[PDB]
Amino acid sequence: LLKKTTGLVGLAVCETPHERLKILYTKILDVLGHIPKNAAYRKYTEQITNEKLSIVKAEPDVKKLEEQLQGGQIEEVILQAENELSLARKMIQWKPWEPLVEEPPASQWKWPI
Amino acid sequence: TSVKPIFSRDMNEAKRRVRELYRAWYREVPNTVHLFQLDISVKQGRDKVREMFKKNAHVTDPRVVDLLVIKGKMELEETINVWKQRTHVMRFFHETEAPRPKDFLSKFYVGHDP
Amino acid sequence: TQLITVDEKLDITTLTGVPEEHIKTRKARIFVPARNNMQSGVNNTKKWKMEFDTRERWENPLMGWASTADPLSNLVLTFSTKEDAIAFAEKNGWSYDVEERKVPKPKSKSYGANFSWNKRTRVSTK
Amino acid sequence: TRPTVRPRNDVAHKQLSAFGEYVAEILPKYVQQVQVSCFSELEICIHPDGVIPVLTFLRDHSNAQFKSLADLTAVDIPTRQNRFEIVYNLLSLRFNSRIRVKTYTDELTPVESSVSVYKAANWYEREIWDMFGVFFANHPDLRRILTDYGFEGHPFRKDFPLSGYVELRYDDEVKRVVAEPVELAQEFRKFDLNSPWEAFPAYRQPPE
Amino acid sequence: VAKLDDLINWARRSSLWPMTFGLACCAVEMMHMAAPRYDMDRFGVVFRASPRQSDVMIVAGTLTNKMAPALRKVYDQMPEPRYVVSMGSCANGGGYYHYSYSVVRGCDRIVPVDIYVPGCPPTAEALLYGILQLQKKIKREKRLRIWYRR
Amino acid sequence: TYKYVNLRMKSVTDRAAQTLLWTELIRGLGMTLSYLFREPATINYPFEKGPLSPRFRGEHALRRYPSGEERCIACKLCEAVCPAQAITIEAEPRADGSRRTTRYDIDMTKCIYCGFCQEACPVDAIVEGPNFEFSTETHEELLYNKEKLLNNGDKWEAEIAANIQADYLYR
Amino acid sequence: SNLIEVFVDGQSVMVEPGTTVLQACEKVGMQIPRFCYHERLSVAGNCRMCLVEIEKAPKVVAACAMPVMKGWNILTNSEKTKKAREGVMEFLLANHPLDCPICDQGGECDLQDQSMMFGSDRSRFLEGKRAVEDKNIGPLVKTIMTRCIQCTRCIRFASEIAGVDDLGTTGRGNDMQVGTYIEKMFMSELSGNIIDICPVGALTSKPYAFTARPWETRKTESIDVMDAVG
Amino acid sequence: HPAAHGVLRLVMELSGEMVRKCDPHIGLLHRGTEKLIEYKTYLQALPYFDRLDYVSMMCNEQAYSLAVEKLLNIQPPPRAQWIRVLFGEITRLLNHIMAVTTHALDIGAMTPFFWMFEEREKMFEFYERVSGARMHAAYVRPGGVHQDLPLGLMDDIYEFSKNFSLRIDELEEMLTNNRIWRNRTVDIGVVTAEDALNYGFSGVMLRGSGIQWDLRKTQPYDVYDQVEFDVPIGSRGDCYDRYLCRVEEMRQSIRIISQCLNKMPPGEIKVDDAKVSPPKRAEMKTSMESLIHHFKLYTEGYQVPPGATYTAIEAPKGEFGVYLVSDGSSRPYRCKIKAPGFAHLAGLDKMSKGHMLADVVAIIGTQDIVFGEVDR
Amino acid sequence: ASATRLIQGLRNWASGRDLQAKLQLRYQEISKRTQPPPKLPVGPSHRLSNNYYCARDGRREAMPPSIVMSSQSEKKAVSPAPPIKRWELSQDEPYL
Amino acid sequence: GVRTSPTGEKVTHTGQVYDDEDYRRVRFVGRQKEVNENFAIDLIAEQPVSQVGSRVISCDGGGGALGHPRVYINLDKETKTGTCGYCGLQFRQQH
Amino acid sequence: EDNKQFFGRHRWVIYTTEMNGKNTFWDVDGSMVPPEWHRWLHCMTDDP
Ligand code: SF4
Ligand code: SF4
Ligand code: SF4
Ligand code: SF4
Ligand code: SF4
Ligand code: FES
Ligand SMILES: [K+]
Numbered sequence A: 001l002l003k004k005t006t007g008l009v010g011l012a013v014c015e016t017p018h019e020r021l022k023i024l025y026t027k028i029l030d031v032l033g034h035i036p037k038n039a040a041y042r043k044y045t046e047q048i049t050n051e052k053l054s055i056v057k058a059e060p061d062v063k064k065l066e067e068q069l070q071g072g073q074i075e076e077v078i079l080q081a082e083n084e085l086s087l088a089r090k091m092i093q094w095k096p097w098e099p100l101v102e103e104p105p106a107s108q109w110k111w112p113i
Numbered sequence B: 001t002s003v004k005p006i007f008s009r010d011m012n013e014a015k016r017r018v019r020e021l022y023r024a025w026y027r028e029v030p031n032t033v034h035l036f037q038l039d040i041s042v043k044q045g046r047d048k049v050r051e052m053f054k055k056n057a058h059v060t061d062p063r064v065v066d067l068l069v070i071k072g073k074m075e076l077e078e079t080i081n082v083w084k085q086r087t088h089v090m091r092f093f094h095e096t097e098a099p100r101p102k103d104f105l106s107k108f109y110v111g112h113d114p
Numbered sequence C: 001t002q003l004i005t006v007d008e009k010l011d012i013t014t015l016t017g018v019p020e021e022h023i024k025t026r027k028a029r030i031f032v033p034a035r036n037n038m039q040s041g042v043n044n045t046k047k048w049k050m051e052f053d054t055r056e057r058w059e060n061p062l063m064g065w066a067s068t069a070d071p072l073s074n075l076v077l078t079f080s081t082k083e084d085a086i087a088f089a090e091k092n093g094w095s096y097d098v099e100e101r102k103v104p105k106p107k108s109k110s111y112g113a114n115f116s117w118n119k120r121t122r123v124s125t126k
Numbered sequence D: 001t002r003p004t005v006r007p008r009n010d011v012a013h014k015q016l017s018a019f020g021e022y023v024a025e026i027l028p029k030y031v032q033q034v035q036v037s038c039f040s041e042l043e044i045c046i047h048p049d050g051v052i053p054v055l056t057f058l059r060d061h062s063n064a065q066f067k068s069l070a071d072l073t074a075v076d077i078p079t080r081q082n083r084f085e086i087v088y089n090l091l092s093l094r095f096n097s098r099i100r101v102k103t104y105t106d107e108l109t110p111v112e113s114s115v116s117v118y119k120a121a122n123w124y125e126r127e128i129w130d131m132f133g134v135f136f137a138n139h140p141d142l143r144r145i146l147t148d149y150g151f152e153g154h155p156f157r158k159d160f161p162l163s164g165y166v167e168l169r170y171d172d173e174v175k176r177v178v179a180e181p182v183e184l185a186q187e188f189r190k191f192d193l194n195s196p197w198e199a200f201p202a203y204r205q206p207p208e
Numbered sequence E: 001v002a003k004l005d006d007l008i009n010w011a012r013r014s015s016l017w018p019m020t021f022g023l024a025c026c027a028v029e030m031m032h033m034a035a036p037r038y039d040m041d042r043f044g045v046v047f048r049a050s051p052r053q054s055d056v057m058i059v060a061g062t063l064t065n066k067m068a069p070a071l072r073k074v075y076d077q078m079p080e081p082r083y084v085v086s087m088g089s090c091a092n093g094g095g096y097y098h099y100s101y102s103v104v105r106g107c108d109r110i111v112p113v114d115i116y117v118p119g120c121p122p123t124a125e126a127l128l129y130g131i132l133q134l135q136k137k138i139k140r141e142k143r144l145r146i147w148y149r150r
Numbered sequence F: 001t002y003k004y005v006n007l008r009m010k011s012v013t014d015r016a017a018q019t020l021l022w023t024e025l026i027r028g029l030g031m032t033l034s035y036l037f038r039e040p041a042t043i044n045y046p047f048e049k050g051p052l053s054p055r056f057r058g059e060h061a062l063r064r065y066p067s068g069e070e071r072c073i074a075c076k077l078c079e080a081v082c083p084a085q086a087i088t089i090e091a092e093p094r095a096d097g098s099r100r101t102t103r104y105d106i107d108m109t110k111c112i113y114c115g116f117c118q119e120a121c122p123v124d125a126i127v128e129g130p131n132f133e134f135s136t137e138t139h140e141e142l143l144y145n146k147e148k149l150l151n152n153g154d155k156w157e158a159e160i161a162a163n164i165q166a167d168y169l170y171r
Numbered sequence G: 001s002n003l004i005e006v007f008v009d010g011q012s013v014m015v016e017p018g019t020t021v022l023q024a025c026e027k028v029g030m031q032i033p034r035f036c037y038h039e040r041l042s043v044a045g046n047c048r049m050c051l052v053e054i055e056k057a058p059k060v061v062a063a064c065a066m067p068v069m070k071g072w073n074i075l076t077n078s079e080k081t082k083k084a085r086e087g088v089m090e091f092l093l094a095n096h097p098l099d100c101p102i103c104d105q106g107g108e109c110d111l112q113d114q115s116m117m118f119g120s121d122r123s124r125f126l127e128g129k130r131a132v133e134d135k136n137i138g139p140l141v142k143t144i145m146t147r148c149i150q151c152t153r154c155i156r157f158a159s160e161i162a163g164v165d166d167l168g169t170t171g172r173g174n175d176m177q178v179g180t181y182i183e184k185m186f187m188s189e190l191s192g193n194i195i196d197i198c199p200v201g202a203l204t205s206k207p208y209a210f211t212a213r214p215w216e217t218r219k220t221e222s223i224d225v226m227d228a229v230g
Numbered sequence H: 001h002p003a004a005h006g007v008l009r010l011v012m013e014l015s016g017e018m019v020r021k022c023d024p025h026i027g028l029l030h031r032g033t034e035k036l037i038e039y040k041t042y043l044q045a046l047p048y049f050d051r052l053d054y055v056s057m058m059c060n061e062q063a064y065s066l067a068v069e070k071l072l073n074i075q076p077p078p079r080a081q082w083i084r085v086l087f088g089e090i091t092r093l094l095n096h097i098m099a100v101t102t103h104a105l106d107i108g109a110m111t112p113f114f115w116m117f118e119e120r121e122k123m124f125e126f127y128e129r130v131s132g133a134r135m136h137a138a139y140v141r142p143g144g145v146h147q148d149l150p151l152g153l154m155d156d157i158y159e160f161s162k163n164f165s166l167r168i169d170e171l172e173e174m175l176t177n178n179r180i181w182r183n184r185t186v187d188i189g190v191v192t193a194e195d196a197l198n199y200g201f202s203g204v205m206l207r208g209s210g211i212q213w214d215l216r217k218t219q220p221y222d223v224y225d226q227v228e229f230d231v232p233i234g235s236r237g238d239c240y241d242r243y244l245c246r247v248e249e250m251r252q253s254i255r256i257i258s259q260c261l262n263k264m265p266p267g268e269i270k271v272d273d274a275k276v277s278p279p280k281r282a283e284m285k286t287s288m289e290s291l292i293h294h295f296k297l298y299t300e301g302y303q304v305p306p307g308a309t310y311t312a313i314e315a316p317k318g319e320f321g322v323y324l325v326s327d328g329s330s331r332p333y334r335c336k337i338k339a340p341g342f343a344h345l346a347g348l349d350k351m352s353k354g355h356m357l358a359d360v361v362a363i364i365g366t367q368d369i370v371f372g373e374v375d376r
Numbered sequence I: 001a002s003a004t005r006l007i008q009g010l011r012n013w014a015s016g017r018d019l020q021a022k023l024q025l026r027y028q029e030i031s032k033r034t035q036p037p038p039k040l041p042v043g044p045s046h047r048l049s050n051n052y053y054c055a056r057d058g059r060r061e062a063m064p065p066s067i068v069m070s071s072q073s074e075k076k077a078v079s080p081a082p083p084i085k086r087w088e089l090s091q092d093e094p095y096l
Numbered sequence J: 001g002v003r004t005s006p007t008g009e010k011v012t013h014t015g016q017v018y019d020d021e022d023y024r025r026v027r028f029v030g031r032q033k034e035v036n037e038n039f040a041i042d043l044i045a046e047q048p049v050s051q052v053g054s055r056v057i058s059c060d061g062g063g064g065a066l067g068h069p070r071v072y073i074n075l076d077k078e079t080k081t082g083t084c085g086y087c088g089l090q091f092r093q094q095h
Numbered sequence K: 001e002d003n004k005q006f007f008g009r010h011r012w013v014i015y016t017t018e019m020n021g022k023n024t025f026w027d028v029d030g031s032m033v034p035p036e037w038h039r040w041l042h043c044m045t046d047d048p
């Protein structure tokens, strides 16, 4: 379609969205491979990433991609994929699939007092 | 009894921060007197800083003295930059309050304060 | 690790900003409030109240309003049980007087006692 | 129960409970409790040391996308030993939802700041230090924003009185605005408005 | 000296120059008074932003503890003669926020107040009445007669 | 549902002629001159007054029964509902045993003029009346006692009763 | 131990035999509404506020008088319990005078509190209320029997604790008045205590009358020194 | 300072005359409302909300009433909902008039201020007729409203709404096409969508940056889903797009006011549960239950079930929210007020980087900031 | 409306619109300052039968918040809500 | 009918009057002491007593919804007249 | 009164010259209106 503006200030339009989306999805799969299998975040993020990759593989039209993926403009989809890759790097950094670090006191979530 | 530290691991580091804060305050007392056109001597302000430091010198908890050091840093930042007024600096020197009685006979004469 | 050990009593009189005279000379009171005898509900005697003493309240020179000098005259705090109230009172250095709660004794009410045969519990009117 | 009673939505309650299970299963290191209120509002209660690795998840995951920080609040409950209750309110625009993330801290325990996640907190938690005394670690510019410059004490603590400890007046003797001990012309009349009968049966705490 | 007193009282009361010192709700009420409905400018009342060229000051809003030195300095920079008109309830006795920890209980403690205008916010017609009362107070001044007697 | 604000040789010549000859500036000046030639909305105060309503919240007053006996019965609902705590009531039974008041003080520099007391009074004794031109010169003059409130009620009864008669069916 | 097991709202609790339904519900932690029952007076059971429903039983029992049995499930907040409470409040407020702003019990009244938290919010009574003439029993109790609800705490206190036996109920039906039938000055050493045990504003402390109000008062605990009882 | 909104202390590091570091020192109007609220009941704490944002009074009343009604599990009658929406749109027009005219006065065009302050006085007269006070109505209450509309008011509302669009067109001719007004706001205060969401901006700022978000269209309240209206969306993030958005919001407010005046249903004005809303004065003096409920409602206050909620409404400045926590008594345990002005003044540091000082006062003007709301 | 016809025409030309059609000053066309007394309608629960308070109480139906997970199969990835639908361009004034 | 204390001050209907040695009377010099001259008791005293034909009588103060809540007064006694709690009006029976 | 003027200018008052002993030829006050005329003048009712 070659839209001049996306309607949002400070969001440049990408010329080829399919290659960028495929590169980002392959990269997030490669990064998520390092997570242990028992983690729930790895399972759910791998599931949604594979679903989005299948959607972007099946159809070539940009407008039908924006309607099927329902993530708005494809620039927002690319930005969300980049943010998820950053979250995956921070996730292998933090390792939050371990159990509870500490237990709260007995009067910590009791409302009312 | 296991607590999370903020800045000071032990009492020695907290005392180092206290000495640093006193060094900075003793440095900046003459500029505070000169810039605000305060009508007191430099010695009065410096011994006021000494009096406050000796007043808050009963604490053995590293976290409490660390927070005291932080709040002194806030006061130093509000004094070094001209964000206060003449009255905000002069509020330390109580000049309008009459001297309260301290012995038992005078307090018995005045009122019911125990 | 990222943790240190502090083995001293929590005293935060220096960070609450209160003046000195309202720390050592004020006697706090930790108690369960008594039920108002004009009513019959006991919901108001469920939680512990921490209060302070009453200072002077003189008359105003204009119309005799209640002019006061105590800033802590309207400070009422609510705690779930006794131990947290004691911990909060000793945390701010306030000397405290603690009164234990007074649970009423479970009575033995019998409706037939008003219609006895050889007892003094025979009622005179109904 | 039609005209004067608020209608009840169950699909939103079910979806919020499912998302709460989703969050509590993705992050078992820090999440302590998940509760959905009667008016369909999710609440997540986590450990303080997991303030930062949770929030960025809710800012960066494709299934949450809580990109807005609406309100940041601390609540003072003097009964608990961790008397300060930090509350983050998050808003997701892509999914059109609101979530609440709650944690606890005492006076001397620092909390990790959230300016690395939401920049609006650059003011918000700063105001918290002005009002309660909760120290935030690695804040860029932490200074008092609401109270007076020379004010000592944190006013929003429940042990702080309604009227302060000092009051200002102009003095011709020193030509200056000075602070004096507080002396009110009329005392604040304290009212006992609590009815001594049981308020709600459904909120009945078990006895001792 | 009686008639010369009558002259300078007429000159000061018919060219009052207030200053743009509002703080709160009551400032919006002052701006509503300055609207074409009530037209302060017809009374010789034109807003001047500098304290050095102002005659009276209408304190509109809540005077907090962070605001008392500012109000005191602004009042002290005004040339004589100066009159202060309290406005609303916040600047009268604290009003709604009388018992608060950071509100001055009436701006009388900082500046000497000449005319008290009660309301929350006072209606612009009532404010015009208060300004006319201040004008009538200026009219009955007796400076030169008292100077002649002394 | 949504719209795009600001998303829009003859035209270039028209724009250059507007630049050089100031067409839209002349249009704005014409509208300014249009507002010059209209009738100004300045009402001649104090000989003219602005429009008001029978529900207007002004000066506090204490009404009376149509037999001379005062209306307040010392029930202390107004001082319990007052959000500013501006009302101070001290009560005792007088000589005939009627529950009346001895002190009824309203701090008018504390009052926020919100009309909760005029709607919480069970006998319509306290009324936020219609008077708004009651500015004073001293702070103590804005501190009404019971005698001043009763005098205000006896002063403004002739219109307070009419306003209540006009408005009481909406409550 | 002979403590039998009963149920309150499906929760088990063990009580001694002879324990009433009200006592069992208090032991669990719910304070059952009441007007005539007092824990230091003989049981009267003549206000029907305490009517609760035991399950598998087609009648509401008086919790202030009826003893419990094994396996009884006290449905404290079912539909018919609330219906009975609302009906009792409607009957109680059917003949009560509109005297709250002149009352000295306002703000500390059991009838107002229980009417808000248990009763309905509007009146179906479109007729004229009764008006009972006032009496006098001395300069210690201001006496307004228009507001009495015939709870009969007066007679039980004057017969059991005070032990003077001069108060009574004269009449039959809606014209029954709680009085003394003569110009008798009820004066004992514990007379003023009746002012504490009137759930309505029928009996008022005469020196205290028309002087203060409960919500504006500050309560301070202290010790009596006029005698050696303490 | 006239360009300052009465209480403000902007300390700026002028590098000659451009700003490199701007810091708004606030707190000159910190009254401490959120400590005075917990010492008062809900009816007594209702007039405190009239004075936070004193150009958006009824919207704050609506937000507080929505919070209390969400906690109380009750809803107002439909006539009360339509009245609330109509007066909220009148409030939106009030705020937009004040903001646009004060911004134009702070830039230098001082005529539309006097042109539309008489219309603002007309709406103040409408408030006077409907509630009894020109500014602080205390009209919207938990349970609906406080009083019904007087007879003959809606004809005045219809006449004013009929004749107000010509004034809107007059203002839009006087400022939008003016070249001097344009050149002050072409590329001043530009913001991006990522920095709009990450800085906590809400309302027009988001709609200045092309972000499509409005609380009246996504999370609707009382009757706003039964009214059709448009939402303006900017395209550059400058002050020009925000001013155009405010003018278009005024036009849509006129549209909503027309829809409200053509669709008001008959009925009552309070929740008929007398334990929350007070009873009528006619039946208070006849029924005993109504007298008891009036006594205890105006002396103690209705109880609220324990719990914490955070509600949010589309205030004329943005998103106005309250976090209300109740412990079961007749007084709130903790009432926190979330305001758009706090985050807007926080983002003022980022929005004003690289501009001249007159552009900083233009950026101050283009944020509709009321500092009583900001300082709470 | 107390202005001559030439001033009327001059104002109409210089403003570009018919100013006298929609005046900004009020006249006799508004409603009268006095009104007949109304008869306010009643609410829905002002009945006499089948109107027990327990069947329509709003405050008593509030429940405590339900704890989902407490610290004392391949489940699909869920969302807090379905995603917000794309906004429709207004057909009345699209500004395009 | 105001009474005059011999310090010169008028006496209010609540009975308050400043003593001759009280310094607070200096607040009244150069000014006036404002006191209502319409005494409530001396204005309700001369209102006549109404004889009714029934045992009990209902009083609302007149005006319907403009007065006090309606209270029923019993006139069973033949010695004292039944006085209204709010308005102060007194009724009786002709027998 | 004059009904041909616009709203707010349709009712007015000319004050007296001597009210309660003071010369009001120039010191005209806004609070010299009796309550019935105060009700009429501020446009509260159409009945004088
Ligand atoms: S007096 Fe009232 S209107 Fe004026 S600033 Fe104070 S709260 Fe606002
Ligand atoms: S109007 Fe409001 S603030 Fe004023 S006295 Fe009455 S209740 Fe109090
Ligand atoms: S509400 Fe009315 S009757 Fe009650 S004390 Fe106040 S003024 Fe008197
Ligand atoms: S006894 Fe209670 S319900 Fe009866 S009038 Fe007195 S306060 Fe009202
Ligand atoms: S006067 Fe009171 S205590 Fe005595 S029987 Fe009547 S209601 Fe009961
Ligand atoms: S309490 Fe049982 S019938 Fe009265
Ligand atoms: K009693």
Ligand SMILES: [Zn+2]
Pocket: J059, J060, J061, J068, J084, J085, J086, J087, J088, J089
């Ligand atoms: Zn009567």
